[PDB]
């Protein structure tokens, strides 16, 4: 019954600000402090601060005092966190939290990069890629922005042996991801291998055939 509702994902430019909402329900809003927590990707939890919605009083982590603003709208049972002068170090999931109940979080990405669909390159099966009776093959999904990308193989008909990796953020500000599958080296002449790449943020789909061929 107690619920905390946050937006999904947000892209923001460096030096800009972000204002996140947290809509509360199922309890008396002014009766519990509302906290904000940050989590950088693959890192731990960090406390930003709290606001008491009954009187607007706040308490902050010194580390965020200079750039975070907490408010509430008691009429809509919504708490807000504004964070300014953003840098890449502020890319993170942000959660609103009250005692016993944690929000789902909002993913904030700080970037000056522009939308760009991927270039899909073959990771072609070779002798330098063939463990005994097994060959590895794949697709390199490079230079796209923002996340995410999804990959399938033979329209999801091929799933066993597939490994689609977390993307990395390159120094360029664009992402790169690989997707591999291991298959019998003997199938490379009877069966076609195609990676199905979809970049929803640019509504782009790419289907690329991955071939050994002559050389």
């Amino acid at each position: 019954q107690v619920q905390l509702l946050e937006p999904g994902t947000e892209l923001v430019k460096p030096g800009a600000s972000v204002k996140l909402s947290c809509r509360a329900s199922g309890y008396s809003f002014t009766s519990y402090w509302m906290h904000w927590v940050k989590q950088r990707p693959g890192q731990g939890l960090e406390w930003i601060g709290l606001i008491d919605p009954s009187n607007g009083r706040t308490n902050f982590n010194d580390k965020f005092k200079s750039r975070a603003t907490l408010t509430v709208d008691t009429s809509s049972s919504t708490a807000y966190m504004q964070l300014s002068s953003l840098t890449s170090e502020d890319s993170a999931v942000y959660y609103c939290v009250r005692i016993a109940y944690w929000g789902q979080g909002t993913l904030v990405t700080v970037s000056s990069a522009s939308t760009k669909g991927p270039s899909v390159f073959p990771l072609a099966p070779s002798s330098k890629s063939t463990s005994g009776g097994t060959a590895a093959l794949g697709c390199l999904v490079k230079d796209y922005f923002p996340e995410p990308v999804t990959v399938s193989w033979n329209s999801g008909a091929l799933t066993s042996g597939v490994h689609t990796f977390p993307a990395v953020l390159q120094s360029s500000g664009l992402y790169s991801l690989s997707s591999v599958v291991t298959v019998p080296s003997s199938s490379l002449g009877t069966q076609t291998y195609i990676c199905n790449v979809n970049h929803k943020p640019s509504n782009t789909k790419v289907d690329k055939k991955v071939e050994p061929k002559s050389c």
């Binding site: 979080g105 390159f121 990771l123 097994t134 990796f165 977390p166 690989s178």
Partner: protein, 214 residues
Amino acid sequence: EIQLTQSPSSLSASLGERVSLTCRTSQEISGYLSWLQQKPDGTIKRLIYDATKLDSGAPKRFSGSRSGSDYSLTISSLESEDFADYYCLQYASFPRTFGGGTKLEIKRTVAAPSVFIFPPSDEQLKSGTASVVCLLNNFYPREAKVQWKVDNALQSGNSQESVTEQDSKDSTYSLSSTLTLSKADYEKHKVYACEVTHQGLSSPVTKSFNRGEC
């Protein structure tokens, strides 16, 4: 600020095993501590509050105890749902602070990776950049060391890697590493290699190719 020191950082264990996680405080917090669980999907749930009280929504296999500045989370008999990340939180002092986390993963036997190397595609080379990819497939444990060499010269700072989540069927990990060179650099050298070490390999495994040669 009151520092919470969590240990172990990572713990490997089996279904059914009893385990305990510890959180130590830099100052006295008198029992004002909770234990939080974060699922592999990101969702966070409270298991214990007031150091030793069970959250109404948490199963009974979770217990909390403490003595002075030592707080422990115990799982009586591990189930599959329990492999996740765990954090302590104190609420005795401002600012509120968290432990650094403990990652609980499923223990299995050592499995050496299968290693594959991929040269840049012709398609990519046409446009100026060369990416070389080394794949480490279905290994355990997760710790693995990949080194790139170009004409036997050890490379530094020009590669990135990522690792999959622990496999649901076989509890292994896989790893992808990408070496990025400009095309100009790539065409000035011949031998490209990835050298792998892992608990499962009695000696390093090197996969290599010579540029422009099938």
